Design an enzyme around this catalytic site. Structure first.
Site, PDB file in Angstrom:
ATOM      1  N   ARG A  47       0.838  -1.195   0.000  1.00  0.00           N
ATOM      2  CA  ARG A  47       0.000   0.000   0.000  1.00  0.00           C
ATOM      3  C   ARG A  47       0.875   1.246   0.000  1.00  0.00           C
ATOM      4  O   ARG A  47       1.402   1.649   1.040  1.00  0.00           O
ATOM      5  CB  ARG A  47      -0.934   0.014   1.215  1.00  0.00           C
ATOM      6  CG  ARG A  47      -2.198  -0.811   1.020  1.00  0.00           C
ATOM      7  CD  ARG A  47      -2.017  -1.931   0.000  1.00  0.00           C
ATOM      8  NE  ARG A  47      -3.179  -2.808  -0.111  1.00  0.00           N
ATOM      9  CZ  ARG A  47      -4.436  -2.373  -0.149  1.00  0.00           C
ATOM     10  NH1 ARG A  47      -4.691  -1.070  -0.086  1.00  0.00           N
ATOM     11  NH2 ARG A  47      -5.438  -3.236  -0.254  1.00  0.00           N
ATOM     12  N   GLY A  48       1.047   1.838  -1.177  1.00  0.00           N
ATOM     13  CA  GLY A  48       2.065   2.857  -1.344  1.00  0.00           C
ATOM     14  C   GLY A  48       1.557   4.252  -1.031  1.00  0.00           C
ATOM     15  O   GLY A  48       0.347   4.495  -1.006  1.00  0.00           O
ATOM     16  N   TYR A  50       2.068   8.234  -2.247  1.00  0.00           N
ATOM     17  CA  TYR A  50       1.502   8.945  -3.391  1.00  0.00           C
ATOM     18  C   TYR A  50       1.634   8.124  -4.673  1.00  0.00           C
ATOM     19  O   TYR A  50       1.772   8.679  -5.767  1.00  0.00           O
ATOM     20  CB  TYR A  50       2.181  10.313  -3.563  1.00  0.00           C
ATOM     21  CG  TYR A  50       3.568  10.380  -2.963  1.00  0.00           C
ATOM     22  CD1 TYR A  50       3.746  10.710  -1.615  1.00  0.00           C
ATOM     23  CD2 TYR A  50       4.698  10.069  -3.720  1.00  0.00           C
ATOM     24  CE1 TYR A  50       5.011  10.723  -1.038  1.00  0.00           C
ATOM     25  CE2 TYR A  50       5.962  10.080  -3.152  1.00  0.00           C
ATOM     26  CZ  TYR A  50       6.115  10.406  -1.809  1.00  0.00           C
ATOM     27  OH  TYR A  50       7.365  10.413  -1.226  1.00  0.00           O
ATOM     28  N   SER A  51       1.576   6.803  -4.525  1.00  0.00           N
ATOM     29  CA  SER A  51       1.682   5.872  -5.646  1.00  0.00           C
ATOM     30  C   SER A  51       1.257   4.464  -5.228  1.00  0.00           C
ATOM     31  O   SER A  51       1.525   4.025  -4.111  1.00  0.00           O
ATOM     32  CB  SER A  51       3.119   5.827  -6.171  1.00  0.00           C
ATOM     33  OG  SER A  51       3.534   7.088  -6.666  1.00  0.00           O
ATOM     34  N   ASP A 156      16.635   8.047   0.532  1.00  0.00           N
ATOM     35  CA  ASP A 156      15.555   7.345   1.218  1.00  0.00           C
ATOM     36  C   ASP A 156      15.949   5.891   1.460  1.00  0.00           C
ATOM     37  O   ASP A 156      15.150   4.969   1.288  1.00  0.00           O
ATOM     38  CB  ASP A 156      14.232   7.435   0.447  1.00  0.00           C
ATOM     39  CG  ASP A 156      13.014   7.171   1.335  1.00  0.00           C
ATOM     40  OD1 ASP A 156      13.103   7.274   2.577  1.00  0.00           O
ATOM     41  OD2 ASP A 156      11.951   6.863   0.782  1.00  0.00           O
TER      42      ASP A 156
END
Ligand SMILES: O=c1oc2c(O)c(O)cc3c(=O)oc4c(O)c(O)cc1c4c23
Length: 332
Positions: A47-48, A50-51, A156
């Protein structure tokens, strides 16, 4: 009152400087879109942010793939990831961008990545051996050294961005959606990375950072792995994050760092760091993690987790540490 002392990468400083403009100029980069109908969405993975990502299959040759559809985000941001991905494609342990397809799902398209059958990072941690960790750390180092040598900071680095197909001993560093081209003297946004993996420079608002940021994040990963406390530095906010770090590395070296680079300490800090001694790494070694620990691992972690970004080991010298002596060494 004054201003902070400038800083530059200790290595690969100018790899982008004399390279053709097309290489690092992503906002003017335009893409030849692949076809959306070449892929069939099978299942929605995870469950990403902003994507959203899906397990999928290429219809033209039944190859399994992972489709990442982009949500309402600025163009130049999509271009940045695409451009960075294309440039690093082929490099060691860098996720391979198999395709980019146009699709009107929200003014935004989709990115197609090679399929990695990775084990749930949460369960995998708990099954790795001393060798597995040394091996995997080495693989991540290959990706960082290559990307840094290609002038890209990941920004990241964290367990969620390191896909591992343990059965095939295959590892890929993913999600280059925050990655940026390094240009010396440039002042970058300190947002990047996940809180628990942010380098001190991001925590004190030092914008002229570099590749070394990824090396701090890598250190946080290493620590969480060998000590089995995921994450290692667990703060509540930027201010609390630095406090969690100081309770281990000590406050003295932190105060020395900020003075060296003349950093304007925010009101919310002067009284929050307090006074802490530098704790010994052996302190965190107990019956649940001693098998993944060793003097070299501790010495290595110690050279990674340093307040001063310029003091931290670069990816390449990290690969030369005795901690990795046992790791294969077949170079191919
Ligand atoms: O290349 C990717 O492969 C993935 C997977 O195979 C997966 O199972 C889940 C994910 C996921 O959740 O997020 C991702 C990203 O945000 C991204 O930028 C790249 C990838 C994935 C990804």
């Amino acid at each position: 009152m004054s201003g902070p002392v400038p800083s530059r990468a200790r290595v690969y400083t100018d790899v982008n400087t004399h390279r053709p403009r097309e290489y690092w100029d992503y906002e003017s980069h335009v893409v030849e879109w692949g076809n959306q109908d070449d892929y069939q969405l099978v299942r929605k993975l995870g469950r990403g942010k902003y994507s959203e990502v899906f397990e999928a299959i290429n219809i033209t040759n039944n190859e399994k793939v992972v489709v990442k559809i982009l949500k309402p985000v600025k163009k130049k941001k999509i271009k940045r990831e695409i451009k960075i991905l294309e440039n690093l494609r082929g490099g060691p342990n860098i996720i391979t961008l198999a395709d980019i397809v146009k699709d009107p799902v929200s003014r935004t398209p989709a990115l197609v990545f090679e399929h990695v059958n990775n084990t749930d990072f949460k369960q995998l941690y708990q099954t790795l051996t001393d060798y597995d960790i040394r091996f995997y750390m080495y693989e991540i180092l290959k990706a960082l050294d290559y990307c840094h040598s290609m002038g890209i900071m990941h920004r990241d680095v964290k367990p969620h961005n390191v896909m591992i197909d343990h059965e095939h001993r295959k590892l890929r560093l993913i999600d280059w959606g925050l990655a940026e081209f390094y240009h010396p003297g440039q002042e970058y946004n300190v947002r990047v990375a996940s809180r628990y993996f942010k380098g001190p420079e991001l925590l004190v608002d030092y914008q002229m950072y570099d590749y070394s940021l990824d090396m701090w994040s890598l250190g946080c990963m290493l620590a969480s792995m060998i000590f089995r406390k995921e994450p290692f530095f667990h703060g509540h906010d930027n201010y609390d994050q630095l406090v969690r770090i100081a309770k281990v590395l000590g406050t003295e070296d932190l105060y020395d760092y900020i003075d060296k680079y003349n950093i304007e300490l925010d009101p919310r800090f002067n009284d929050i760091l307090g006074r802490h001694s530098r704790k010994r790494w052996e302190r965190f070694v107990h019956s649940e993690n001693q098998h993944l620990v060793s003097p070299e691992a501790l010495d290595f972690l110690d050279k990674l987790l340093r307040y001063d970004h310029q003091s931290r080991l670069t990816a390449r010298e990290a690969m030369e540490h005795p901690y990795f002596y046992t790791v294969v060494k077949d170079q191919a």
